[PDB]
Design a protein around this ligand. Structure first.
Ligand code: 2AQ
Ligand code: CL
Ligand code: CL
Ligand code: ZN
Ligand code: ZN
Length: 124
């Protein structure tokens, strides 16, 4: 209820933007909205980050940059290269977590074997 710009400004200027958003969520803060939801059939591979939407029946698909805290905050990505894994791609979010795609991508890691989210889609 505070608004996306209010939350994103708070996280953007924090020394640790990821910790700012995680602590905000843990405090009961309403997730960031206005992520770009994709029209899909839910018959996809269910892999986490894809060239085209790949949601299975347990997922929703979103535009990648819209679900990236660093993209949404207009700040550098936290790696030497400043590379973004999500920009220009589509991200599959478990339906149970799809009320907060930005928090989900921030908190989770892609399985290097099967390419699905560890602890969710991944069955390795
Ligand atoms: N995951 C999933 C399955 C079926 C849907 C139907 C309509 C909207 C969203 C859906 N999501
Ligand atoms: Cl907005
Ligand atoms: Cl998943
Ligand atoms: Zn990004
Ligand atoms: Zn796996």
């Amino acid at each position: 209820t505070m608004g996306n710009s209010t939350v994103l400004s708070f996280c953007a200027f924090a020394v640790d933007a990821a910790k700012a958003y995680k602590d905000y969520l843990a405090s009961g803060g309403q997730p960031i909205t206005n992520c770009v939801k994709m029209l899909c059939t839910h018959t996809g591979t269910g892999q986490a980050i894809t060239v085209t939407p790949e949601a299975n029946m347990d997922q929703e698909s979103f535009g990648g940059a819209s679900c990236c805290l660093y993209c949404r905050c207009h700040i550098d990505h936290p790696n030497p290269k400043g590379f973004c894994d999500l920009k220009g791609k589509y991200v599959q979010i478990p339906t149970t977590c799809a009320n907060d795609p930005v928090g989900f991508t921030l908190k989770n890691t892609v399985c290097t074997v099967c390419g699905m989210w560890k602890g969710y889609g991944c069955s390795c």
